[PDB]
């Protein structure tokens, strides 16, 4: 049930991927102390709809009431935007976007540091991105996804942090969440060999503290059990003949779009 994309399919994901990356690049100037998450959400939505002529995949998904996910500090993921939640100096915030264009999905997220960063915040964001980059560098045909989850874990743990088990990367295409489940840790349950034409996301969530998490009464919001800060980055990629191509690459990414093995 793992869908293999045709080249035409891939051309469309490249567009959707770029659109999604673009929302992230666009929003940056608005991320400042005093802005509410509800306003960031509206700016995004407007852009998506009125400028891009695309659609947010989040709006209505299983009942999701907003256009993007905004997770502050200890919120792990799926934080709900709100007019009352204002950003302060030193906050670390994840903005997660998923756009639909020509029926294809593009899913990506990045951390933003509000005003003057904290040492921990900065550190955690860095290590989290590096862990995603590490995984990307390993992607190529013939390798088992298991090896990827394991390298991520090993890296993160050596850096004194913890990896969230409960949520993971996923296949993506015409469908928002397709097979397979991309675990960010070492698990004997994982046994998936990569092949060209496969499209999925890698989106490790790392905790400054302990790995444990808790779901809010809102049924969306996830927070760390120990209230420590949590960070995440996400990219959508396609497995190529000799490596991978990052479909959601941004101007600020410091990794090449095409990774080649030889
Ligand atoms: C409404 C659920 C939002 C899904 C997230 N973009 P992900 O698939 O990265 O967890
Ligand atoms: Co995703
Ligand atoms: Co996402
Ligand atoms: Na967070």
Swiss-Prot record:
Removes the N-terminal methionine from nascent proteins. The N-terminal methionine is often cleaved when the second residue in the primary sequence is small and uncharged (Met-Ala-, Cys, Gly, Pro, Ser, Thr, or Val). Requires deformylation of the N(alpha)-formylated initiator methionine before it can be hydrolyzed. Belongs to the peptidase M24A family. Methionine aminopeptidase type 1 subfamily. PANTHER family: METHIONINE AMINOPEPTIDASE (PTHR43330:SF27). Its cofactor is Co(2+); Zn(2+); Mn(2+); Fe(2+). One of its GO terms (molecular function) is initiator methionyl aminopeptidase activity. Monomer. This is Methionine aminopeptidase. A divalent metal cation 1 binds at residues 96, 107, 234. A divalent metal cation 2 binds at residues 107, 170, 203, 234. Pfam families: Peptidase_M24 (PF00557). It is an enzyme of class 3 (hydrolase). GO terms for cellular component: cytosol. GO terms for biological process: proteolysis. Substrate binds at residues 78, 177. The gene is map. Binds 2 divalent metal cations per subunit. Has a high-affinity and a low affinity metal-binding site. The true nature of the physiological cofactor is under debate. The enzyme is active with cobalt, zinc, manganese or divalent iron ions. Most likely, methionine aminopeptidases function as mononuclear Fe(2+)-metalloproteases under physiological conditions, and the catalytically relevant metal-binding site has been assigned to the histidine-containing high-affinity site. Coiled coil: none annotated. The keyword Protease applies. It catalyses: Release of N-terminal amino acids, preferentially methionine, from peptides and arylamides. Keywords: Aminopeptidase, Hydrolase, Metal-binding, Protease.
């Amino acid at each position: 049930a793992i869908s293999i994309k045709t080249p035409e399919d891939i051309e469309k994901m490249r567009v959707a991927g770029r659109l999604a990356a673009e929302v992230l690049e666009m929003i940056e100037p608005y991320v400042k102390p005093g802005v509410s998450t509800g306003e960031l959400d509206r700016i995004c939505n407007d852009y998506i709809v009125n400028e891009q002529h695309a659609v947010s995949a989040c709006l209505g998904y299983h009942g999701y009431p907003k256009s993007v996910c905004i997770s502050i500090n200890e919120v792990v993921c799926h934080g709900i935007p709100d007019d009352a939640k204002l950003l302060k100096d030193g906050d670390i915030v994840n903005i997660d976007v998923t756009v639909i264009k020509d029926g294809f999905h593009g899913d990506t997220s990045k951390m933003f540091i509000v005003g003057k960063p904290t040492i921990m915040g900065e550190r955690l964001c860095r290590i989290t991105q590096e862990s995603l980059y590490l995984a990307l560098r390993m992607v190529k045909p013939g390798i088992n996804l298991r090896e990827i989850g394991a390298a991520i874990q090993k890296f993160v743990e050596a850096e004194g942090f913890s990896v969230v088990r409960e949520y993971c990367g996923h296949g993506i295409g015409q469908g928002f969440h397709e097979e397979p489940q991309v675990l960010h840790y070492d698990s004997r349950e994982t046994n998936v060999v990569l092949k060209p034409g496969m499209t999925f996301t890698i989106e490790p969530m790392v905790n400054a503290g302990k790995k444990e998490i808790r779901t809010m009464k809102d049924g969306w919001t996830v927070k760390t059990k120990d209230r420590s800060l949590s960070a995440q980055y996400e990219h959508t990629i396609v497995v190529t003949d000799n490596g991978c191509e990052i479909l959601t690459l941004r101007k600020d990414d410091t990794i090449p779009a095409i990774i080649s093995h030889d």
